[PDB]
């Protein structure tokens, strides 16, 4: 059976941990404030590399597989997760970001969520995306969350709306 943990507890286990350490928890609560200040989307390679340089003339070079490639556009979101007991900043990556977008606008397939966001933002439709992110404000989910010493960074591994 699944055992949930309060944000309060997670934070204190985090404070009391060594550098390389990582732990996963199941959390219940809501999403607050998807952040629109930073770059929402990034170019990624099929080699699981985020390290992708954009060259002139529609070229992209992957630092990992060390070659020019044709990248995908992936969502990387930063938000706050909040239960009755606490609040934390988390990073949500493409599988889960895309899943959220798709869940508010099911016309947008997970596969294309990043591109959708990029095309809107870069062509004067940022508002349309702000709107989108707002409808998630205070929506409740069950998350699987992971922390790690580096600061303590928290990442969403999994999301389910219930
Ligand atoms: Zn690569």
Ligand 1 centre from 35 Cα, in Å?
28
Domains, the chain, ordered by start: 1-40+76-162 (2.40.50.140), 41-75 (2.20.25.10)
What value, to the nearest 5°, has the Cα angle with vertex 131 and ends 129 and 136? 100
CA 144 from chain centre, in angstroms, equals 12
User: Resolution of this entry in Å?
Assistant: 2.5
In the chain the beta strands, taken as DSSP E runs, fall at 22-32, 41-44, 52-55, 59-62, 67-69, 72-75, 77-83, 86-92, 140-149, 152-161
Token pair, residue 119, equals 């095309």
Q: Are 101 and 75 in contact (CB under 8 A)?
A: yes
Instruction: Name the method of structure determination.
Output: X-ray
Ligand 1 centre from 158 Cα, in Å?
24
- Residues around ion ligand 1, judged by CB within 5 A, are 45, 47, 49, 62, 64-65
Asked if residue 47 belongs to a known ligand binding site, the reply is no
DSSP, res 109? -
Ligand 1 centre from 156 Cα, in Å?
24
Ligand 1 centre from 75 Cα, in Å?
17
Asked if residue 45 belongs to a known ligand binding site, the reply is yes
**Residue 71, Cβ density class (10 Å: 0-12 exposed, 13-18 middle, ≥19 buried):** middle
Ligand 1 centre from 68 Cα, in Å?
9
Token pair, residue 32, equals 């607050």
Token pair, residue 122, equals 């870069």
């Amino acid at each position: 059976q699944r055992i949930y943990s309060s944000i309060e507890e997670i934070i204190q286990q985090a404070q009391a941990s060594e550098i390389g350490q990582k732990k996963e928890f199941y959390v219940y609560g809501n999403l607050v404030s998807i952040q629109m200040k930073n770059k929402l989307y990034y170019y990624r390679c099929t080699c699981q590399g985020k390290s992708v340089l954009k060259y002139h003339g529609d070229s992209f070079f992957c630092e990992s597989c060390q070659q020019f490639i044709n990248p995908q556009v992936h969502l990387m979101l930063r938000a706050f997760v909040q239960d009755s007991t606490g609040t934390i900043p988390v990073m949500i990556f493409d599988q889960q970001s895309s899943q959220l977008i798709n869940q508010i606008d099911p016309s947008i397939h997970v596969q294309e969520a990043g591109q959708y966001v990029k095309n809107c933002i870069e062509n004067g439709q940022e508002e349309i995306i702000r709107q989108l992110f707002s409808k998630l404000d205070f929506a409740r989910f069950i998350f699987e969350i992971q922390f790690e010493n580096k600061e303590i960074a928290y990442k969403v591994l999994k999301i389910e709306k219930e």
